[PDB]
Short mmCIF file of C-alpha atoms in Angstrom, two decimals:
data_model
loop_
_atom_site.label_atom_id
_atom_site.label_comp_id
_atom_site.label_asym_id
_atom_site.label_seq_id
_atom_site.Cartn_x
_atom_site.Cartn_y
_atom_site.Cartn_z
CA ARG A 1 -0.01 0.12 -0.24
CA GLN A 2 3.08 2.40 0.95
CA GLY A 3 5.70 2.85 0.32
CA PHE A 4 9.40 4.51 -1.34
CA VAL A 5 10.20 4.63 -4.64
CA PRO A 6 13.09 6.52 -5.80
CA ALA A 7 12.45 10.12 -7.05
CA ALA A 8 14.40 10.20 -10.45
CA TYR A 9 11.71 7.54 -11.43
CA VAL A 10 8.81 9.43 -11.07
CA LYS A 11 7.57 12.95 -12.47
CA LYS A 12 5.48 15.79 -9.55
CA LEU A 13 2.00 16.90 -11.45
CA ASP A 14 1.51 20.15 -10.61
CA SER A 15 -0.55 20.43 -7.55
CA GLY A 16 -4.57 21.01 -8.19
CA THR A 17 -7.30 19.98 -5.97
CA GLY A 18 -6.17 17.27 -3.62
CA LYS A 19 -3.17 15.12 -2.72
CA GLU A 20 0.11 15.48 -4.99
CA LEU A 21 0.25 13.19 -7.90
CA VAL A 22 3.17 11.98 -9.59
CA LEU A 23 3.42 9.85 -12.72
CA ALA A 24 5.86 6.62 -13.20
CA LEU A 25 8.11 7.59 -15.75
CA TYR A 26 9.29 3.19 -15.91
CA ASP A 27 8.38 -0.12 -13.83
CA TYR A 28 9.88 -0.13 -10.57
CA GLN A 29 10.19 -3.33 -8.78
CA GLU A 30 10.17 -3.00 -5.13
CA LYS A 31 13.84 -4.13 -3.68
CA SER A 32 13.20 -3.92 0.02
CA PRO A 33 10.40 -4.45 2.53
CA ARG A 34 10.25 -0.69 2.27
CA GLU A 35 9.72 -0.25 -1.09
CA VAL A 36 6.49 -0.83 -3.50
CA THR A 37 5.85 -1.65 -6.89
CA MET A 38 5.09 0.96 -9.51
CA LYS A 39 4.52 0.09 -13.25
CA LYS A 40 5.10 2.88 -15.88
CA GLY A 41 2.27 5.32 -16.57
CA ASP A 42 0.69 5.12 -13.87
CA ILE A 43 -0.62 7.80 -11.06
CA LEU A 44 0.24 7.57 -7.71
CA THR A 45 -0.43 9.66 -4.56
CA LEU A 46 2.23 11.43 -3.10
CA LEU A 47 2.80 11.31 0.68
CA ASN A 48 5.88 12.40 1.27
CA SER A 49 8.65 13.77 -0.53
CA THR A 50 11.35 15.83 1.71
CA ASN A 51 13.71 12.97 0.47
CA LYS A 52 16.01 13.93 -1.75
CA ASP A 53 16.10 9.83 -2.65
CA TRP A 54 13.47 8.44 -1.58
CA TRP A 55 9.74 9.64 -2.53
CA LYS A 56 7.17 8.28 0.15
CA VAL A 57 3.72 6.71 -2.48
CA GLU A 58 0.86 5.47 -2.23
CA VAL A 59 -0.04 2.98 -4.40
CA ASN A 60 -3.68 0.91 -5.35
#
């Protein structure tokens, strides 16, 4: 459900109504328990982007 993905592999969309959103630029299979898997083209809810390298997102 919730986990980290490399910030380099997602693009932050402009802010609008509601939560922040990011676009998955590439497929990424989780490599450690704290990570999540995303498929290229996925629109993920961004939970925390304070870290330069790992962003916390929510995967549906």
